[PDB]
Design an enzyme around this catalytic site. Structure first.
Site, PDB file in Angstrom:
ATOM      1  N   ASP A  56       6.470  16.060  -1.086  1.00 59.18           N
ATOM      2  CA  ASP A  56       5.962  16.928  -0.024  1.00 59.18           C
ATOM      3  C   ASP A  56       6.294  16.428   1.384  1.00 59.18           C
ATOM      4  OD1 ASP A  56       4.074  14.776  -0.763  1.00 59.18           O
ATOM      5  OD2 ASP A  56       2.820  15.594   0.847  1.00 59.18           O
ATOM      6  N   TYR A  90      -6.582   8.273   2.632  1.00 63.07           N
ATOM      7  CA  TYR A  90      -6.046   7.168   3.420  1.00 63.07           C
ATOM      8  C   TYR A  90      -6.847   6.934   4.683  1.00 63.07           C
ATOM      9  CZ  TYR A  90      -1.722   8.392   0.859  1.00 63.07           C
ATOM     10  OH  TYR A  90      -0.775   8.723  -0.083  1.00 63.07           O
ATOM     11  N   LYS A 128      -5.381   9.295  -5.138  1.00 67.94           N
ATOM     12  CA  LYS A 128      -4.147   8.683  -4.625  1.00 67.94           C
ATOM     13  C   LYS A 128      -4.477   7.802  -3.419  1.00 67.94           C
ATOM     14  CE  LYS A 128       0.313   9.685  -2.497  1.00 67.94           C
ATOM     15  NZ  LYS A 128       1.124  10.765  -1.918  1.00 67.94           N
TER      16      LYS A 128
END
Lengths: 268, 268, 262, 269, 265, 272, 265
Positions: E33, E147, E178
């Site tokens: 992506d 993140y 993730k």
């Protein structure tokens, strides 16, 4: 995969490749929705086992009502039936929508099926169900299998070549991606059903035959007439060697084997 | 709880635990919806009292229509009925949906129930109701109890093994979590109903029996046939000793007691 | 009376159609126009509503069209005597419409035993839910009428009808007097919701009518919902006062008959 | 339960009985939503165990975010699902947004939902609206609503200040919360003012882990004395060396009116 | 499937079976992506080829934006988040695709990206929470890329912030998480243990040697990772298909870096 | 475009231009929905080919059910307008005259269709239900700027002659009153009676072809006359796709409709 | 049509057939939406005439705002974006028209304008992604005009920035991308190769000589452009029909600049 070269729907293609064999471009579907219309018949009492044996035999997909899936102690394709009606109803040929396409999607199904008895009382209501459901299927990228059968007050031979062909056609016309219908009795008349229907046609197995010979010969004949595969229930799950008879069917459908080479798969 | 270690629905899972005995994994439900179909019959006139005695006797849950809840030991599970029809109607076997699942949820109910007379006029409309309601119940995490009975113009024995097993299977096929139905008369035939239905089956009590012996023996056998519990109304709330007869039933259902011991709980 | 009612809006509104120290109600239904046309007493509706209000009625029950021209109850059911099926009732007005008109309650009519009556069972059950949501009191007029009901005042058929209405969610049930204090007391005891009696066709003497009201109150009725016997009487104001005497003040027939002048 | 003698909502009543003790009409709630705002802190790493010990100790309900409930169901206490979210690592650590819907909590079988409002924080009015709106959807579904009201923000030097704490509590009741969670103000008298000024039952928060069990349990005792309807403590329970024990201690004080000395004995030190 | 024996959701279970190895119960996802945020970078110019090589190498699934799928066997994960490096706020992420769109395209899962610590990051908190609910309803597995990034963060691999970021994602409803490897087996094991959902590691920028990269995966797996979701280190390699086989060796077969390098052609 | 000069609907205008010939302001539509009601009949078995030949012959548009379109060879050949049928019913049904809505206007739009059509058998059982369908669909068509073609036919237990002038004229008027833009109907048998159908209907009328005629003479003369009566074009199926020379018979029809050619010149287009 | 072989959408296919030449599989679009952002400029005052001349010259389609459509055949593209030069933020674009409105008007396609790098540009990212989905559902072709524009971009023609913007559009669901020519055949060929969707070039401000303009179009086609979408250089020319024919010569017939020039009178 040529069969649906014309299908312009990414979703449908993805799910279709999970119920059709990549090489042969044919399918072996084992319908197990009889429970609703006929009650717990032979072979559908321990459904978990039947699904397993059939999967073991190489079937590409099983077709069930949502209630059987949720009770499933689940690697094959899953088709969820949307139609319901019973033999004990005042009108045993009546079919109403009992499950939604959305429900089938959130369950992870690869396709949905609808049953339309063309010629039954108020059958036009089912015409509309098919047409509408076809649209919601188109939107969700959900393959639609329409089981079209000529059945009602004035139909003596639900297997008549003209009627069965008219019915399959009707199904393609209203948006069905695939059509399930009865074998007409001979390769020529059934080839007319196939040619008159823009959608791939898959044959039903009918009541359990007396000999494996009869049943397997009909598959071979239907395939010869141009069928895109088979959708047989009783002749498979009511057989003494479910895994074996299933392999036999796959031999004929996916490998073009002849009845003799096909019969070797059945345990004697 | 092994009984529902197959349910992939946290909501239904938490609610079923409020109407099923933890250790016995069985349930004693006392249906009290007769008011709608038969009027204020014996035992359902002072509903507030009946609910209390039954709760006192150890029942796991009571089943009522929304209107009776609003008005009236510790607590008991509440199941709200969604079906309505009356004996004075031109078609006494007709059932329409009179309450929504959402209404039952905002009332704090632990489950909902629907009644389907398989074989009655236009029964296919009820097939659809069941199928649809099953989906809305799945979404809300609301346990669904489907009361399936073979009743219609062409059914003379509403307790016929075949018809009952079929009626029960329909229920499971279309989405019910639990099915309450008629005892078929003998342990063997009823065991067929239980084995042919993927969903836990609970037995109805039927009309008030002449002796406690008859009633308790039938519950005992149904349990032996594999029933997941009982859903009896008249035989409990029309009994002279409601609290007592309820304890008797619990002895048999939750403690596997024999009729002999169970009867000692009834004051004469 | 409504101690068990856990709905703030229903309580506030139910206080506008119920006498506070008597806890009974005198409702004057005037919806006959839809089913019977402009009958006696309902031709100059504006006047009737006034006289009845003057006499002390707690509320009037009308169709939306009449209002659009005491407490107000709006009827949601419609059907006519000239229809191929005169017992058929369909929903002709919504609860929301009644609310935006300022009504204090709504009513529905269900002929239990009529053709396709199950459709009305569903209407009642659904409307009950929308009423519960809006805090709108619901009055269900339950009558056992149909092709197999020879006596629509039959004790047990009427007690079944009243009960049906409560089971499905009505807050108040309207129904026919069964003929005697004992049988009607059974209707009252078998129905969890307060029961209010209908007046029936105009009686020959005030005696007959007022006595029936008295027996009904004695049987345990929560009030009365009479139309014809009030708006078709020769002294509307007076007969209404008579009714209030019996219902709100427990007066006896001989002391009530005294309110009727002329 | 004379505590909710005025809740005219069958659904809220039925569900409130699954988180409050019938005998004492008080509640011991163990909030375990700290994960979202502070990360996997001590005691909330093995959530499945904590929920078990706390349940074992007698807690009436646990409060979690939807994501953890999809795990922590032993099947072997009332469940309250939190609808608010915000983190300590965010540019605005006092910001809270709605991350879960009431409907989701209902279809999960929860007995109640909770919202967190930092009165005085930046754009706190947006949370005022969330509370008011959620209160209405809770009223419709019969879902009990617990509003955690705390005065926090740039101009608030003392967060346990009695005038602000009580203003916050009043805020949650006015807007529709069924129950109010808030900080103890430090003394029985000022907290009694918070309780009296708030039409809804008030439950006290436990705050950071105290140095001695004495401090903590005494705080709980005082709050109950001030009129609290129960307690909603997290860290002081799940960060303790004997979760089951400290929980029993708390229950002794809340449900049995036991005194600190009697309650400490329950702590299997 | 021992990994999700707790997911009381049929559709997710069925679709996750198309993203995870039955035998290893681990997954090798190749995110592609980057186009949205960084433009047509190396390896993502001829996307059709990359998807093929990666599939060939044994990847379990590819992760793409809807537009790439529609312009031309592995599992398909559709990304729902969008933001770019050329934006005034490069850390901003908005929802650009719906779960329903992903479903009607036949995807097996969806993914969202949340920069915890970025400006107005709370808006993304809400997006995650809401999307988690719509995913739960549709039986669509949700992968949340968590993140910690923003004005007060320079070490975006701090064991504290990463463990929190992962925990946050699981608390709010994601089925898989993730995240970045924290640098050492012990700290990352804390990320794994503090997060109720299976954690999958990101690959980061292309490393100088295959040694560095593959050792990174061998460690993460050791720390308890449920698999890997690496993009650049795979599609920017000189042998896309070989490096992918290497990764699969480590993830699905527990192979060591030694016996793994022997795959890179 | 002069005949649609009274349509205050931009979308409909744009879309009608893709089905009508700019100069003649007439249209040649080839309906191919027979499959649903009669099964795979002659000429509709290899639909892809028929659509091609008809397009080749100069037809302005083809009329199909959604299912037949999806299964298409929508490639180069000569672009033609697409009309999607919304009505369904079959000859094998207990009530062969019953028609229900099987496709939505929205579905037709997202498929790129230029118009939609509905079939109403005025006089059939519960035909009032179809009256409502037409009225409602007309509104949704008005909103989407989708041209609506209403096929109005007098068929029922009491209609022995479905070509009856007073009946056809009633049925055609019905379609226009309820919102249809164009109306498809049977020729009444003679120029005068049909001219009454045309004058009594505010909407442009297009004639149906009927069963395959014995000679091209009969068919082409019928069309020629209908045009003379004031028809806005033709919507024939069987007489075109069941003819030996499809492409040819289609050109013949176009000659008559778009060029006012006479039957004798027209026949010169039909292969040996 | 070869250009859209991977486009599985019957409706879009059909509507694109109307804005593209079937033999050259290229398109000549004449955008005329400048009115909204710059007011009634030269050539857009008598819009009715301009549309006619351009249609006469052979343009495949005109692009307008709904208000103008309202007040030789040629496809119609309706613009959905709006913003003005007099606004406090001239680079801001908001959705002013819906896809449904364009459909009920008979349009063959819709267009959106995204200034990548502008303030709060992420909001436009979301608009594009959402509109792409509603376009997919309605079978409406979507043309995304992607441009690098913001307080930190000095050359809005920079090869990296433009390729990134165009790739952004494709990724989020645009069927065709409109963007600026980068200045040379090689860099623009990178924009074309990095973008999965057909790219069409913008004309820019009116050039001093027809030579400059036509040569630009020529290089763009050489770089791999699927056509052109020029406004000012066509409707602000002294001979509209003529310059349009010139453009068509180059785009549909591969004619060279010398031969094209002829068509101009």
């Amino acid at each position: 995969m040529e069969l649906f070269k014309d299908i312009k729907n990414l979703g449908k293609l993805v799910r279709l490749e999970r119920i059709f064999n990549r090489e042969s471009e044919k399918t072996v579907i084992v319908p197990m929705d009889h429970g609703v219309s006929n009650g717990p018949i032979k072979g559908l009492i321990d459904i978990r086992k039947t699904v397993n044996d059939v999967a073991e035999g190489g079937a590409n997909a099983v077709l069930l009502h949502k209630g059987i899936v949720r009770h499933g102690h689940r690697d094959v394709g899953l088709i969820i039936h949307l139609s319901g009606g019973t033999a004990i109803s005042p009108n045993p040929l009546k079919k109403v929508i009992v499950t939604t396409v959305e429900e089938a999607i959130r369950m992870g199904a690869d396709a949905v099926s609808i049953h339309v008895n063309v010629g039954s009382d108020e059958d036009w209501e089912a015409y509309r169900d098919l047409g509408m459901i076809a649209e919601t299927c188109e939107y969700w990228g959900m393959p639609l299998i329409a089981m079209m059968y000529p059945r009602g007050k004035h139909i003596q031979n639900e297997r008549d070549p003209e009627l069965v062909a008219h019915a399959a056609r009707l199904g393609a016309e209203l948006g069905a991606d695939i059509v399930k219908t009865s074998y007409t009795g001979d390769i020529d008349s059934f080839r007319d059903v196939v040619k008159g229907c823009p959608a791939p046609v898959v044959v039903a197995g009918g009541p359990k035959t007396n000999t494996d010979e009869e049943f397997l010969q009909m598959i071979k004949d239907a395939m010869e007439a141009g069928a895109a595969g088979v959708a047989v229930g009783r002749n498979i799950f009511q057989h003494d060697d479910v895994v074996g008879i299933t392999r036999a069917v796959c031999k004929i459908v996916h490998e073009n084997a002849d009845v003799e080479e096909a019969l070797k798969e059945i345990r004697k």
